[PDB]
Amino acid sequence: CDTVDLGYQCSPATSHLWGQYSPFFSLEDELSVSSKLPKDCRITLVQVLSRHGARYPTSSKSKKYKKLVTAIQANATDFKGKFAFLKTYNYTLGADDLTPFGEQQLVNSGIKFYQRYKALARSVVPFIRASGSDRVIASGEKFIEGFQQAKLADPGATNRAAPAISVIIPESETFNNTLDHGVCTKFEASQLGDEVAANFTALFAPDIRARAEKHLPGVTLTDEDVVSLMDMCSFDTVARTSDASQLSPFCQLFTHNEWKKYNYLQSLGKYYGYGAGNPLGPAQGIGFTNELIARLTRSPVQDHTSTNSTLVSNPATFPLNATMYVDFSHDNSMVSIFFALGLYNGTEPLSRTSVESAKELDGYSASWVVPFGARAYFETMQCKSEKEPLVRALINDRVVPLHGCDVDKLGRCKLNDFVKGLSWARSGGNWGECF
Ligand SMILES: *[C@@H]1O[C@H](CO)[C@@H](O)[C@H](O)[C@H]1NC(C)=O
Ligand SMILES: *[C@@H]1O[C@H](CO)[C@@H](O)[C@H](O)[C@H]1NC(C)=O
Ligand SMILES: *[C@@H]1O[C@H](CO)[C@@H](O)[C@H](O)[C@H]1NC(C)=O
Ligand SMILES: *[C@@H]1O[C@H](CO)[C@@H](O)[C@H](O)[C@H]1NC(C)=O
């Protein structure tokens, strides 16, 4: 179901419509040119930004879910049609940790990285950091495991030492961490994403609630419980087998039309939570953007947002010449980073009353952009076509054409043009508003 190259391709009419809880699916050639290395080009640097893999719900949501399943089982006088399974369903999900399927997605991601960049990766041990969350660290470890699986199988690799995770950045409201938001006080108090999500859920959940209630006489559901039962389709699917080879019984409770509403609900929460919809959302990605610019230009970091000046100024924790960098993060920071980088500056503000496809949204959606196991590659390449290095961004294998610079038909800008166009981030954006 899940493969190294394509990601997850089982039940795609449903499993690609779970927003950030979809398993990564490759978007190669989707509303995009090919991601292949263009003719007469050589990659000279690649930064990877990866989310952790498929996981259990957080302890908070896992509690909520289990409470709800228990109340259904306590309350229902019957379990009719497709709801019959709920009679005997045993809630066994954990909390926070990767599932075994999620571990394997990250090993696959490491294999794909080595294969895609084999020319470089044969001699390079990437410099790796993870945000200090156990599932993020564990994802980094499984990605290294995959990368080395591939590397040791290639008799042409010369530099075979395994990479370590060199920096684990603490997650704290008081620690400047560019791979997880937390310090920007005002933004942390924002309720906008949640209010947009609740207001949208109020539009679509009532029909589904009526229908679920009709099949579960005795039960009363809130619109929130509707969304919980939809969330359980992805969580149970990624936990119930090691290879996510069995779609959860929760999934068939809801129609394909309803899945496209759920998918949009998730795109809404991320856009108004962390993307350009939130007035401080892209500011959360400034720190990483200035770290990437330092890496792309081989120059010291210039930033006063969420970088830590101790960590960026020591080459042990922030080398400027490692050629391959891999950083592990979370969905919501990755959303803010991609928007800080201007990669979604063709996406107009999301309708809060109609579902717009990732195509009307210029390739933006939570499942296209921050699935479980999401990855972005930011490449520099030297092409016979040009003196200057050219930059390209790939998000889940979709070429996402750069904004703010003179972009070509392959989605590329010259490096210094790209960096000049990132003037908002380079100047610290509206980070002052945090305080
Ligand atoms: C910066 O990182 C140093 C090194 O671990 C740590 O002592 C300090 O508290 C961090 N400061 C902030 C604000 O993140
Ligand atoms: C939530 O409820 C109503 C829907 O009409 C709206 O006027 C209010 O502003 C909403 N909050 C947000 C952020 O949309
Ligand atoms: C942490 O970030 C704030 C800007 O948000 C800055 O005032 C402070 O100097 C930073 N501290 C470190 C150690 O980077
Ligand atoms: C993207 O649009 C925003 C909002 O207009 C602007 O602040 C930013 O500079 C643009 N980014 C790029 C890289 O063009």
Curated annotation (Swiss-Prot):
Subcellular location field: Secreted
Binding site for 1D-myo-inositol hexakisphosphate: Q20, Y21, R51, H52, R55, T58, R135, D180, K270, H330, D331
Residue spans crossing the bilayer: none
Major enzyme class: hydrolase
MF GO annotations: 3-phytase activity; acid phosphatase activity
Record's catalysed reaction(s): 1D-myo-inositol hexakisphosphate + H2O = 1D-myo-inositol 1,2,4,5,6-pentakisphosphate + phosphate; 1D-myo-inositol 1,2,4,5,6-pentakisphosphate + H2O = 1D-myo-inositol 1,2,5,6-tetrakisphosphate + phosphate; 1D-myo-inositol 1,2,5,6-tetrakisphosphate + H2O = 1D-myo-inositol 1,2,6-trisphosphate + phosphate; 1D-myo-inositol 1,2,6-trisphosphate + H2O = 1D-myo-inositol 1,2-bisphosphate + phosphate
Record has Signal as a keyword: yes
Application of this enzyme or protein: Phytic acid is the major storage form of phosphorus in plant seeds and, thus, in seed-based animal feed. Phytases are therefore of considerable economic interest.
GO cellular component: extracellular region
Broad class of where this protein is predominantly found: secreted
Quaternary data: Monomer.
Family note: Belongs to the histidine acid phosphatase family.
Record's protein name: Phytase A
Gene name per UniProt: phyA
